[PDB]
Design an enzyme around this catalytic site. Structure first.
Site, short mmCIF file in Angstrom:
data_model
loop_
_atom_site.label_atom_id
_atom_site.label_comp_id
_atom_site.label_asym_id
_atom_site.label_seq_id
_atom_site.Cartn_x
_atom_site.Cartn_y
_atom_site.Cartn_z
N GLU A 101 0.83 -1.21 0.00
CA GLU A 101 0.00 0.00 0.00
C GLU A 101 0.88 1.27 0.00
OE1 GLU A 101 -1.35 -2.89 2.27
OE2 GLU A 101 -1.66 -3.13 0.07
N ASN A 159 8.53 -9.74 -3.89
CA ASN A 159 7.35 -9.77 -3.04
C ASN A 159 6.16 -10.26 -3.88
OD1 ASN A 159 6.16 -8.67 -0.26
ND2 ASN A 159 4.67 -8.30 -1.88
N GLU A 160 5.69 -11.46 -3.57
CA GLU A 160 4.56 -12.08 -4.25
C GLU A 160 4.70 -11.96 -5.75
OE1 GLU A 160 0.91 -10.34 -2.69
OE2 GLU A 160 0.95 -11.77 -1.04
N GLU A 240 2.86 -13.44 6.02
CA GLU A 240 1.95 -12.31 6.24
C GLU A 240 0.61 -12.83 6.72
OE1 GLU A 240 1.54 -9.89 2.82
OE2 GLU A 240 3.69 -9.68 2.46
O1 GAL Z 1 -2.18 -5.21 2.95
C1 GAL Z 1 -2.20 -6.16 1.91
C2 GAL Z 1 -0.83 -6.81 1.73
O2 GAL Z 1 -0.99 -7.78 0.71
C3 GAL Z 1 0.13 -8.61 0.50
O3 GAL Z 1 -0.29 -9.51 -0.50
C4 GAL Z 1 1.38 -7.79 0.07
O4 GAL Z 1 2.51 -8.65 0.04
C5 GAL Z 1 1.59 -6.68 1.09
O5 GAL Z 1 2.69 -5.79 0.72
C6 GAL Z 1 0.31 -5.88 1.26
O6 GAL Z 1 0.04 -5.14 0.08
#
Ligand code: GAL
Ligand code: NAG
Ligand code: NAG
Ligand code: NAG
Ligand code: NAG
Ligand code: NAG
Ligand code: NAG
Ligand code: NAG
Ligand code: NAG
Ligand code: GAL
Ligand code: CL
Ligand code: CL
Lengths: 602, 605
Positions: A101, A159-160, A240
């Site tokens: 974000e 990242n993803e 996460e």
């Molecule tokens: O808050 C949603 C989160 O979603 C994940 O998929 C991403 O790796 C994060 O950086 C953030 O964007």
């Protein structure tokens, strides 16, 4: 001496040859003033976390090629040493793309100077920039690695990436090679992706440990099964584990129930998995640092996230619930926890109009405008964030309303329109691509265009900003532009050199706080009743964007350390749409400081 | 040039030729740490007060003749400048006697070196000492007078002298002459007495403006009529309009309803009267500064007073109520009010016994004891406050319990008794004058005697302390005393010498440490210390004497701990001197502990 490894035999980490499992929380140093880093990290330690996880936003440290910011609030190395001091290990996520974000997913906007750049791929120019950045960032991180006596135990690559369309494995292999060059062969490198084969397909790489992410709605067995397809042996890891969710302006504030987070957290820990809570504290997108999603919707100034620590670091019922879960698995530190900060309602502060943007162009644009036959983007005029003024003259008489339009939906992201200093309304990306205007032949047509935040996820992260395509008046392409990049941050610091809609304008006022009072200044929350949409600074510090017209965030967080007692505090507001200041009541042209945030307004 | 005067013609004050009346509140700088002076003073200004009133406790500034304390927490001159800087005027009340529920009404205990001294009279030795004090204090106050550019607008002479038995008008004239000598002929000098002719008879003096005091239970008309009998012309003044009342150990906490204070205040102001609210903040009697009334009853450590500002300086409903009434007469300052400070519960801190008092004698009394045929008083052994150990030998076998008595009731005020290190109980002024004791002939008899506070009001302010008369054992006078004055403050600050010099339990010192993290903007914070399972004693944190605790009596259970004496990273050391019974014998270390809480309990059952 010191070692940190994946042991594939106990499906575990080994720290100094001992079984180790991490219980981590996300904290972004770019979202918390350094003034409060020790407060937030100690609150995190007191919750029973044995590690923290963080992102390194490239654009926060390299605003222009070869120009670096690593001091004060930008001092990532200090932030890591502080974690280490407090007995916290560190999971480092240096990107180069972080999503988060955050403006353009952490990627510097100057990348877009090559208009055809394919971000997050083996594009040679993108690779060359990444390599230079890694050559500056990673030798800084090397001494902070666990085996070199620092806190950093694992490092995420990208990242993803599995969520991105490019699927360029050579890009991932490049990053692997370059991370290894700078950091050595022992450091545990890993990747994070959605917990499904469809996400893992393009995100996982040989020699990078594959981890997954998922929140409270996911079947935990199935999620780890998906990880196990990629890594039959080694620790289960949820990188996460979502404690809440992001917001967009105009949408209801996202919340996740404490019971759900606690229940899933216990489940994950009981499996022997390492886990990171995203976010543990969310904090704030100050200035212009927020990101956006596609189809275009910007995230707000607050990154409260409904996290266990509130935006201002407060201890929430979610915090104590998660601490209680952790205590079932591990002994947590003894003693009282640092408190939620005291908050103070400084009350109402009257402002007065300083100057309209239109009357302030000498101060905002001291180099002079750039002339162009057709409109140019933010990148082409060398401005990355904030506002750019586009000026032309009316080619015809518009006594009757005439359609001003961006047929290709090229107002990125919002334009405040005026003709001969008479406000006409607003053009909006994806929503309003036509506006009826009036004025005489030859009248000055002005469009103040706001970059509302570059998209940070999906294909459309190459988000230029400005008038990215032509405008037409009565179907005819408007030509002959005079474009003013606006130095808003300098201009606000100098009180603009003076050291239904209204014209975009700056309003300023002062308030004093007494000296010699041990518990002042305090943190506070600024609110804008009667205002519409704009930017706010206190003592030159850009606190972010307000939009009580749209919500859900009504108040902005004001940390106490920017407030003084030796001289008056200044507040400057740039109001973009409508200011409550034309009335004959000066008391209406005013902001209010309150002692409780409002981020979940309906 | 500046002027402040009584306008007799128009029943008013004149300030720079303009009509003026004051709305004042009492604040005792000796009861607020200097760290917090600006805080309390600013809240006072924000309430709409245009003046503050304060006492100068003589004993607070002159602990021995010619030895003076005017720095840090003792800095009256700074306090007055700070008030001036905030736009507040000052009504100064320099005594030399102040009453004030303060040790001996502010008079120094060394005055009692003349045993027969008649305090607050023309006694030559009393006057000589007063004169020397005034010649030090008053020249410091001269530049702070309104007409010399400072805040001081009026000055009280003495304090309710009409309530005292002596009725020595020579004494009042002597003060008047000396105040004029040092301060000049323009300063408004005034007296304050109870609002009744029987008080005013001996308190009022020609040339000193007569004012009265009264609280919420007084008829306002009658009170001001009593003033008017003494001053037919000039401003109506209530110098001590009571917002609350004092406490005593063992009695319920005194309160006065907000509505009563608000209504009376409205009625006083509506008469055009000048008024001072006693107390506006009360604060704390730290160390041994509390007083006592007669028949002997000591006031506690807290001087919260039920004032509009609480002991820790909190904004109360009373504060806002009084501000609302003041707003009905005058405009009150604009802007937000400084808040009640944050309070933090540091939680439970374990202590352990370091040394008994008897074991720490060499450090408490490094110059050795004084020997005497019969007991000597505190004053005779050159100790004014705290504790003195009186020691003798048993002249007879006391295998069967034998009565230890003070036949003339002369244990002033409490004695903790031990025979060969075995605690025997407590002797108490008035209440218990005999204690049965046992021990072998030649056994060491110790009495640790505490000064619980010198009486501050009445005829009996000449309160010596210690064993003020003989002790008897089986009716025979006990002779041959070894008396140890105890330097407890020095000894606590050196950890009983451990840091060098750069049912009953024996009285003993118990210590424990706790840490507060550094780099946290909002730590340390103010707190309140509680003593569950403890009985009676004295408490220090980092060598600062916070005062006396007595959960066994109440109503005060907690003691206020100001944040500025607390430190980060370096351990904070708590020292408890427990006098009667410590919760520290059992195999449960957890019980030997104190607790920090975030809310005061001064009004418990
Ligand atoms: O808050 C949603 C989160 O979603 C994940 O998929 C991403 O790796 C994060 O950086 C953030 O964007
Ligand atoms: C998750 O999925 C598994 C099968 O993979 C199923 O057995 C289990 O019931 C599911 N758990 C929950 C909580 O739905
Ligand atoms: C502008 O005006 C024309 C004619 O009145 C009308 O047809 C059109 O719908 C209006 N468009 C907008 C975008 O307001
Ligand atoms: C605008 O129109 C001109 C002429 O049709 C075209 O050459 C140009 O590409 C357009 N520019 C933008 C920025 O859309
Ligand atoms: C406000 O304060 C600034 C500096 O902090 C000062 O230069 C200015 O004169 C003040 N303006 C007003 C309107 O109070
Ligand atoms: C107070 O006393 C006066 C007489 O001096 C009397 O008129 C009045 O009624 C009394 N006030 C009250 C409230 O009793
Ligand atoms: C002291 O002991 C005697 C017995 O010799 C007893 O009569 C008397 O009540 C006791 N006094 C006290 C104060 O306990
Ligand atoms: C103690 O007793 C003796 C002998 O009766 C007497 O002279 C002396 O004054 C008394 N002392 C005190 C301190 O009471
Ligand atoms: C308390 O701390 C001080 C300073 O570190 C030290 O002298 C003393 O021995 C400590 N006591 C304990 C039990 O830690
Ligand atoms: O709190 C009761 C008060 O009583 C008054 O009579 C005296 O002047 C004050 O000093 C104080 O003792
Ligand atoms: Cl993170
Ligand atoms: Cl006073």
């Amino acid at each position: 001496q010191r070692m940190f490894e994946i042991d594939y035999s106990r499906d575990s980490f080994l720290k100094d040859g001992q079984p180790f499992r991490y219980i981590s929380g996300s904290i972004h140093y770019s979202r918390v003033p350094r003034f409060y880093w020790k407060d937030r990290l100690l609150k995190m330690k007191m919750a029973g976390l044995n590690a923290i996880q963080t992102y390194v936003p490239w654009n926060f440290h390299e605003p222009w090629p070869g120009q670096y910011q690593f001091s004060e609030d930008h001092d990532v190395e200090y932030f890591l040493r502080l974690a280490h001091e407090l007995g916290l290990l560190v999971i480092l996520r240096p990107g180069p793309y972080i999503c988060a974000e955050w403006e353009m997913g952490g990627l510097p906007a100057w990348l877009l100077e090559k208009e055809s750049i394919l971000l997050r791929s083996s594009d040679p120019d993108y690779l060359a920039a990444v390599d230079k950045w890694l050559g500056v960032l990673l030798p800084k991180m090397k001494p902070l690695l666990y085996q070199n006596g620092g806190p950093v135990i694992t490092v995420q690559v990208e990242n993803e990436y599995g969520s991105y369309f490019a699927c360029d494995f050579d890009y991932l292999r490049f990053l692997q090679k370059r991370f290894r060059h700078h950091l050595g062969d022992d450091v545990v490198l890993f990747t994070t992706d959605g917990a499904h084969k469809t996400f893992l397909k393009c995100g996982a790489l040989q020699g990078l440990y594959t981890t997954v992410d998922f929140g409270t709605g996911s079947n935990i067995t199935d999620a780890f099964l998906s990880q196990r397809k990629c890594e039959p042996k080694g620790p289960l890891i949820n990188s996460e584990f979502y404690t809440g969710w992001l917001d967009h302006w105009g949408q209801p504030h996202s919340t996740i129930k404490t019971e759900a987070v606690a229940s899933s957290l216990y489940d994950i820990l009981a499996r022997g998995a390492s886990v990171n809570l995203y976010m543990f504290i969310g904090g704030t997108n100050f200035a212009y640092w927020n990101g956006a999603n596609s189809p275009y919707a910007a995230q707000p100034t607050s990154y409260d996230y409904d996290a266990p620590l509130s935006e201002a670091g407060d201890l929430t019922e979610k915090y104590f619930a998660l601490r209680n879960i952790i205590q079932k698995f591990e002994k947590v530190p003894e003693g009282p926890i640092p408190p939620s900060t005291p908050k103070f309602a400084y009350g109402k502060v009257t402002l007065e109009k300083l100057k309209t943007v239109g009357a302030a162009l000498d101060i905002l644009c001291p180099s002079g405008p750039i002339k162009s036959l057709y409109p140019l983007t933010f990148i082409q005029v060398k401005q990355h964030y904030g506002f750019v003024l586009y000026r032309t003259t009316l080619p015809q008489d518009c006594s009757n309303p005439a359609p001003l339009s961006s047929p290709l939906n090229g107002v990125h992201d919002r334009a405040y329109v005026a003709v001969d200093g008479i406000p006409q309304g607003v053009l909006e990306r994806n929503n309003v691509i036509t506006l009826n205007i009036t004025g005489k032949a030859g009248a000055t047509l002005d469009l103040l265009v706001e970059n509302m935040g570059r998209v940070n996820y999906g294909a459309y992260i190459n988000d230029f900003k400005g008038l990215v395509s032509n405008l037409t008046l009565s179907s005819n392409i408007l030509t002959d532009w005079t474009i003013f990049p606006l130095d808003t941050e300098d201009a606000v610091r100098s009180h603009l050199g003076g050291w239904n809609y209204t014209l975009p304008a700056f309003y300023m006022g002062n308030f004093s706080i007494p000296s010699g009072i041990p518990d002042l200044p305090q943190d506070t929350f600024i609110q804008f009743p009667g205002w519409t949409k704009g930017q706010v600074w206190i003592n030159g510090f850009n606190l972010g964007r307000y939009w009580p017209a749209r919500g859900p965030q009504l108040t902005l967080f004001v940390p106490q350390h920017i407030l003084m007692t030796s001289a008056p505090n200044t507040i400057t507001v740039l109001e973009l749409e409508w200011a409550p200041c034309s009335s004959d009541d000066p008391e209406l042209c005013a902001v209010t400081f309150v002692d409780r945030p409002v981020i979940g307004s309906s």
